[PDB]
Design a protein around this ligand. Structure first.
Ligand code: HIF
Length: 294
């Protein structure tokens, strides 16, 4: 199959204002449904949904990616790697119902951007234009990463998504959000204390906590601290590899730098595989509910 080209196509007649309204609806529901997952809220799962719907991309043939919004098809939403994301999709259902004009890919990705910003993270420029593609364009399961591997695995894995060392380490800071759930992934526990506030806590915890390699109730190894935090073997690999370690230390000591680098890497992740016409609108930077006094 020849390398497909996905050209961004703006939803008919829509502009910044239309998308800010969708952002707002998502942000308002995030505030409303705050009891989810023992009051962590839907922020983390929406970020993970944005990542997993974008992370199926393969730079070699442009298959997968955020463009098609293929997670709406059974093969992909039933991917074992996506266990638990159905909660995020259900959250977005009423949003898509109110704004039926937005594409699935635009909604999934915008959900992640909205969550990060509302959780006090950096502003993440976002571009519209993803177009829904047929069920036969859904990528096969197995493109998302395993968590029981080492640094070499992580480095090699992300090369498929065209991410370098700094981009990988910056992206990983998102694990400051939410937690692992034994029933979903075979891992259990949060990475930090501020589960629904976007900060550089992930890096400080990796470096400052005293970690012990233990077996959880699913008989899988994970690193645990007496504080009640955990790290996946892939997370811990960031301090085992000397190159990753240097970057982890940088972000643990510069919140602004982490925010700026994460913003760039996350937008890149959400845009991989998409060709934006020269005359396409500039990226949108949405105002938070707080900035709008809403
Ligand atoms: C090395 C690559 C990665 C691996 C192996 C990996 C494994 C897991 N990630 Fe995660 N991840 C991102 C966001 C989030 C978020 C948010 C969650 C929390 C979900 C929740 O419902 O709380 C979240 C949960 C989990 C879980 C637990 C799922 C569950 O049990 O519910 C696993 C096992 N992740 C990213 O954005 C990204 C790219 C950077 C940090 C990124 C990279 C990797 N992630």
């Amino acid at each position: 199959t020849t390398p497909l080209v996905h050209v961004a196509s703006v939803e008919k007649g829509r502009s910044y204002e239309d998308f800010q309204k969708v952002y707002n609806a998502i942000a308002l529901k995030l505030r409303e449904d705050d009891e989810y997952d023992n009051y962590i809220g839907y922020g983390p799962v929406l970020v993970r949904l944005a990542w997993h719907t974008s992370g199926t991309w393969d730079k070699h043939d442009n298959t997968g990616g955020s463009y098609g919004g293929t997670y709406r098809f059974k093969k992909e939403f039933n991917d074992p790697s996506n266990a638990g994301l159905q909660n995020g999709f259900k959250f977005l259902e009423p949003i898509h119902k109110e704004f039926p004009w937005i594409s699935s890919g635009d909604l999934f990705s915008l959900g992640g951007v909205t969550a990060v910003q509302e959780m006090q993270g950096p502003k993440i420029p976002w571009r519209c234009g993803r177009v829904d593609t047929p069920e036969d364009t859904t990528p096969d399961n197995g493109r998302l990463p395993d968590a029981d591997k080492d640094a070499d695995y992580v480095r090699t894995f992300f090369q498929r998504l065209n991410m370098n060392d700094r981009e990988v380490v910056a992206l990983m800071g998102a694990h400051a959000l939410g937690k692992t759930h034994l029933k979903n992934s075979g891992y259990e526990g949060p990475w930090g204390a501020a589960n629904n506030v976007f900060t550089n806590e992930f890096y400080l915890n990796l470096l400052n906590e005293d970690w012990k390699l233990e077996k959880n109730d699913a008989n899988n190894e994970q690193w645990d601290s007496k504080s009640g935090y955990m790290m996946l073997p892939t997370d811990y690999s960031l301090i085992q590899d000397p190159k990753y370690l240097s970057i982890v230390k940088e972000y643990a000591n510069d919140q602004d730098k982490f925010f700026k680098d994460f913003s760039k890497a996350f937008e890149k992740l959400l845009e991989n595989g998409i060709t934006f016409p020269k005359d396409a609108p500039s990226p949108f930077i949405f105002k938070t509910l707080e900035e709008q006094g809403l």
